[PDB]
Design a protein around this ligand. Structure first.
Ligand SMILES: C[S@@+](CC[C@H](N)C(=O)[O-])C[C@H]1O[C@@H](n2cnc3c(N)ncnc32)[C@H](O)[C@@H]1O
Ligand SMILES: C[S@@+](CC[C@H](N)C(=O)[O-])C[C@H]1O[C@@H](n2cnc3c(N)ncnc32)[C@H](O)[C@@H]1O
Ligand SMILES: N[C@@H](CCCC[NH3+])C(=O)O
Ligand SMILES: N[C@@H](CCCC[NH3+])C(=O)O
Ligand SMILES: N[C@@H](CCCC[NH3+])C(=O)O
Ligand SMILES: N[C@@H](CCCC[NH3+])C(=O)O
Lengths: 470, 470
């Protein structure tokens, strides 16, 4: 019969040899299944590599081997080899290479996007190699795969490699030929690709390893794509904010796009496209409860019992207000406003309007590498102040209500009633054409309290059917 | 002993000799007041002039004398002169010219924005001259003023002439030299100005005659600027839609900027600026109820007991939905989207977003000269369809809630409760940073019934003092 499913594992699932032992244990929980494993770098080593890169640019040549992130990375992997009882030879070569590259960066005081992609590639290259070797140690015939060396073909822009159509038949042929010759559990690298023109190593951008998994899924026409987490799938809210988060058994690919990336930390909208096209359900599973259903994401689901699906919190968002009387009935003000943002390399999140104003939220900082500094903020405001009365408000927060659009008025009446009870007034509201997501801009300090109250009202007040029938 | 105030009158107020008689009666109602009168063109002549322009472009030379709109404008003014019993000479010369200008357009088959401004200038030029002559007929010493001849100094962009700072000193000086020499009631053309470097006749764009009134106000430092209508000021909604519309006694310049243009048909936001910076209250009065207060627009007002201010309806709007998985975390998607619109000469109104979509609504057609034709839409969609999945939805409507931002949640709980009762789901919601204006996108067919319901709940349910206190 052959290959059955793809299993994707994030950084923290393989943060140590001990965690790696859990993953291996999962594979052996389903021997009636023949999976493809997709691994990220060992928890936090991807971030560590990038930090090492930036540090290298300006530390000096004679002390690139001293960069802390380098010895953090070196030691994690040496130690993981020891603990799992692997031949350290292969990993030691890759680590010496890593140090060499950083000596290169330090010498040149230069770090291009092309180099950045190469740097991070060590991460999952080390990951998959350690894990594959370990499986062979414990009797599991396994083969490690560098995505960029099988059929993963992308464009040649680096931080954001776009998967090209020729990937699907190339990957399918490569993984199939190897499996039929002699079957071994494929252990494939995360957010990596080859790139058409340069041949250089590429990262898949946002929704990295998830995209790798979904791509494999479509290429091999598998029955489902599985994404593993430490909680029971997608939850009604973030358990960090409020302990009473409950699992959400069924999602729609559409609902997921509005939810899974900021609600869970998985399945960026771009990653689910190969699964939407191939019509392959995506499942989010708990590695601490692997026999449980989790969350299936499909094209459609039974909405009969559906009122609210989940609550989402964005924290510490910067809001801008852009007011001008000239706006009303003028062509090209919106074009000018967002052009300024594009010129200054800033991505904007939420947008709302009035007759004489446009209001903004900038992407949450956690979506990027750094918070914007006062310089960069004073720069947008000055540029904007040429055409409008501008006003900047730091320390705000977004609450997103993801629910069944057929009961929007029901949702909103209840929601604002709750906020009214607490004396909370939403500063900014934005919902698009019958979209499942509606955003409230609130103060950072009152956000958690609001989320908890909203959760109590929607998910802890029993079955919500006051719903008008006959 | 000095000019005391400026009174502005719209087209319908001077649509005929009979309506003009009402205006003169208003002037004589306040002999203890010395007004400056700002007149629009005789109801619908402005539109008729523009219509005559378009027709001239392609009817042929011999036929220009027979343009329907030209025949209408000729007889209205000839007949008005007849009834007011004035010397027809001045008017007859101006009508000769008008026919000559159209004969020119007809020959050349070209209508520039420069000509367009000259064409419409005849409206107020006729209007003011008839009224001025009539006042002198009945014992009211009066002097007609062409705005472009008294120091309304403007930029040389035609459809949208911008008032330049040199206007205030020039106008105050010209209007005072004439009044001190011998006092007469000034009758000024409303929609007009003179280009700085062309010396050519200019129209003030949106804001129109209202702007002329407020400009004169600031220039002469008067106590108030009065805008005349046929109803008791600004109402709680449009009486055309629901009979129970009630006067809104007090308004804020900010509230007015979100309300007056679409709620009433007066005071475009750009027209209130000279009154804002000059710190002069604007009053909206009823010509059928002249001793009544109406609506005073001031910097600030007593917000105690203020909950909802007014409900606004925008009929027949076109909504667009623009969805892409790529925009989440991308710089410049908003910049491109609205660039397309700018390149296609279209002004967008309401905007909202989701994690992977941006939705928007196009300026209501009444704000323009024509509705967008099916071809023009298909081009917007095609252009947008290159970067996203696009959906066009005709036959929607906007309900705008203008209220007290301090009771946002209260207002919203109630509103959505009403909508839920009716079984209505809002398709798109948009409120900017603590703005008084929140917009719902609804279906055109259900809109009117919704407005009535909302009005019943907010303005007819008695005193709405159930606020959280101790
Ligand atoms: C603002 S531009 C940098 C300035 C300039 N364009 C350049 O490249 O030299 C991007 C930087 O700001 C950070 N950043 C923080 N918030 C951002 C946002 N909302 N959109 C874009 N970049 C953001 C990113 O991590 C990145 O380091
Ligand atoms: C949209 S452009 C016409 C498109 C044409 N291809 C061009 O570039 O000149 C302006 C015309 O469309 C009409 N129009 C209707 N709705 C409009 C809107 N929302 N924004 C701009 N123009 C609009 C105006 O009356 C005006 O006559
Ligand atoms: N795969 C790397 C970078 C993030 C990719 C997101 N799937 C890691 O988690 O260490
Ligand atoms: N490209 C857009 C991204 C946001 C799209 C709407 N959620 C920007 O520059 O901010
Ligand atoms: N004079 C025209 C237009 C004035 C400007 C209106 N915005 C009228 O009769 O209303
Ligand atoms: N300049 C904007 C006008 C609308 C601004 C938002 N209310 C446009 O091009 O559509």
């Amino acid at each position: 019969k052959g290959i059955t499913c793809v299993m994707k594992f994030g950084g923290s699932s393989v943060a140590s040899a001990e965690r790696m032992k859990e993953v291996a244990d999962l594979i052996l929980t389903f021997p009636e299944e023949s999976p493809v494993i997709v691994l990220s770098a060992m928890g936090k080593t991807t971030n560590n590599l990038l930090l090492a890169g930036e540090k290298a640019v300006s530390c000096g040549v004679s002390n690139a081997s001293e960069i802390e992130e380098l010895s953090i990375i070196k030691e994690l992997h040496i130690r993981t080899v020891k603990e799992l009882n692997i031949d350290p030879s292969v990993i030691l070569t890759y680590l010496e290479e890593l140090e060499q590259l950083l000596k290169g960066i330090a010498m040149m005081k230069e770090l291009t996007l092309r180099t950045r992609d190469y740097l991070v590639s060590f991460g999952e290259c080390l990951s998959t190699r350690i894990f594959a070797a370990y499986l062979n140690t414990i009797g599991v015939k396994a083969r490690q795969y560098d995505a960029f060396e099988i059929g993963f073909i992308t464009t040649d822009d680096f931080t954001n490699g776009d998967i090209l159509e020729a990937t699907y038949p190339a990957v399918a042929k490569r993984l199939y030929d190897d499996w039929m010759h002699d079957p071994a559990v494929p252990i494939v690298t995360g957010f990596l690709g080859k790139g058409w023109k340069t041949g250089a190593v590429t990262t898949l951008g946002r929704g990295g390893s998830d995209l790798t998994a979904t791509t494999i899924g479509k290429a091999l026409g598998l029955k489902e794509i599985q994404v593993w987490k430490d909680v029971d799938g997608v939850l009604t809210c973030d358990p960090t904010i409020y302990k009473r988060a409950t699992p959400v058994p069924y999602l729609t690919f559409d609902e997921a796009a509005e939810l899974a990336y900021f609600g869970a930390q998985v399945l960026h909208p771009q990653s689910m496209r190969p699964a939407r096209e191939g019509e392959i359900p995506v499942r989010v599973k708990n590695s601490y409860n692997p026999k449980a259903p989790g969350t299936i994401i499909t094209k459609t689901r039974d909405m009969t019992k559906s009122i609210l699906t989940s609550i989402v919190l964005k924290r510490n968002v910067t809001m801008l207000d852009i007011a001008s009387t000239r706006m009303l009935g003028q062509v090209g003000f919106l074009a000018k406003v967002f052009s300024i943002f594009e010129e200054l390399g800033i991505s904007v999140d939420v947008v709302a309007t009035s007759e004489v104003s446009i209001s903004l939220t900038l992407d949450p900082s956690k979506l990027w590498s750094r918070e914007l500094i006062q310089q960069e903020l004073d720069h947008v405001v000055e540029e904007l102040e040429k055409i409008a009365v501008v006003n900047l408000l730091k320390g705000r927060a977004i609450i997103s209500l993801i629910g069944n659009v057929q009961h929007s008025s029901l949702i909103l009446e209840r929601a604002f009633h709750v906020l009214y009870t607490k004396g909370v007034n939403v500063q900014m509201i934005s919902q698009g054409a019958s979209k499942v997501n509606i955003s409230f801009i609130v103060n950072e300090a009152e956000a958690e309290g609001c989320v908890q109250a909203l959760h109590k009202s929607f998910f802890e007040s029993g079955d919500l059917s006051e719903l008008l029938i006959q």
